[PDB]
Amino acid sequence: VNWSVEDIVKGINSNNLESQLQATQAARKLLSREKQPPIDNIIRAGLIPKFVSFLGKTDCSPIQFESAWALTNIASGTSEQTKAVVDGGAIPAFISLLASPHAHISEQAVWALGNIAGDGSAFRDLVIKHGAIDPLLALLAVPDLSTLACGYLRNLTWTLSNLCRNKNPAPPLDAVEQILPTLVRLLHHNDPEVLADSCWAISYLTDGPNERIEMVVKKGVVPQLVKLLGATELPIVTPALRAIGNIVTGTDEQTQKVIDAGALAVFPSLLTNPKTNIQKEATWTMSNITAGRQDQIQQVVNHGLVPFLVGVLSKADFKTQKEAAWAITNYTSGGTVEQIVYLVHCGIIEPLMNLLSAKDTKIIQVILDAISNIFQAAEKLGETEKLSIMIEECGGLDKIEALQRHENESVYKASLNLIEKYF
Template identity: 40%
Template sequence: MTRDCVIASGALQRISLILEKASPNTSFLRNASWALSNLCRGRPQPDYARVKDAVPTLIKVLIENENPDIITDICWALSYLSDGAKENIHVMLNDDLVRKLIALMNHQNVAIAIPCLRTIGNIVTGGDDQTQKCVDFGLVGALSSLLSHPKKSVRKEGCWVLSNVTAGTEAQIQDCLDKGIVEKLVEILEHDDLTVKNEAIWALCNCTASASPAQYHQLVNKGILRALGKTLGQKDARMLAVALEGLENVLECGEKNFKNTDGENQ
């Protein structure tokens, strides 16, 4: 592949050096950012050992620049580099980077918001500690506003990111409950486009895998049973399977923890 030949020639290191030394927000920096982004993309992915050293430079350029074209190219490069093995995610766990990406998720330019969501989404596919770092920097609150975004592509990506948060710890699920995420996911499942619903169903049902009994009670009060029941009318087999699993989890928790005086599941 031509891309790999270019990387093997040492071009990536030279472009990174240009990015390090170029003045912020210049057309020269814009061209270098675009070139580096293209070297990081594609299938199969480039050899990570050859491209990972570009990450510190990408972080520096992202933080120092305000030009939307430069930011877009850098964010896409980071999304490509964070997609894959745990090692890919680990090098992204820079406090300044995570904070910046979460802030940019709400950028009015969707071309910037989407790659930021992808990168954060890749990070939270890691362990609970990696997810918690993002949560500590306000991820859940930032995602809450995006679930009402006018662009369905942004709502879809936001639901995908949330599906990895709600699959986490009880504390992470509680953060979603406290910030109104569940109500918005319920609304999406009842009224949104099917492509958004396909991600929202995972985000909502993942809550039912690790929630505490008290959290199950909150989920029911916030309308999860109504939303999952309505999903059973869909023809998509995957959505049906996920909804049924979520319903099963809720009913099993009710059987164990919320029987009435007659021994029936409340």
């Protein structure tokens, strides 16, 4: 307790394994303190290579543990600190410890590899190349996950989620295929932290091209994801919703699996959720559903979600309102005349017009496109004048006229076109 770095060095440089153990535990305690652990001072003392060599002392398990914990905490820091651990040779030494007969040492190695992989795609891929996946997955090859210690299982799930994480590049396809069956099993486990990190892992794996989405959807997980979308724990709902959102960015068939699994029945709650980030990500998800086929738009209608989109457009955080505007422009670009009429009957025009007062150029462009699409539907019914009156009555004509004189060229063009054609 409270040793100086100088004393730690003195003990670690002794030729006495027990003196080395005591000094390594003292380093672990220094690195474990709540405020400002002296990571850089330990690195600068040259201690990483010694710690790494201690990981290999099978005949002294306590010093394996203390050095694993010390190196975990060094690797928990900046990229430069994690690099110092990797440059010491720690990756293969930790992978060898995954097979330790001492569960607390195996777990510490799991943790350290999670920090290293969590640094970014290069270290992730280097952990994979040194062969970490097979022994990690072997630790979870039990008939019932509930026999494992809870903290150990949580750490295993977390580390596997970091092997799934990051882009440019995404993880190797073969590694993802190797991990996915275990992730599917963890997604059905009943611990909330395991469920959260399993959802995070799936949200990473579905953040990319449609072929990556397909790898996940083919495993049949969309129904469990929709169940978790309904959980009461916000740490579960957040990544489950991110994963669902990612999936509906894919093909119409991938989106339909989300719809078939019952997801839309959760959106009344998600679109009114008191957490701003949930409302925003739910509305983004809705906008990618309304960019789908007419029969998918129809499912949005049937689930009663158009009033909820009108609500979010009327009042929500601005970022959420922007996603809602997108959802409406997609809806009106893809929908039938009857669907677009319905949108107007639900009260979309006034909140849409109110958002033309925003200082964000992109949302104005989006709203003008939506108004154009609605006017096109009205043209097919011969009701353009009725719509013009509605837009004038709520103050929308004033806002569009003003937008004729707007810095962005596309805004001015769109406004003038609307006025000349309909007003």
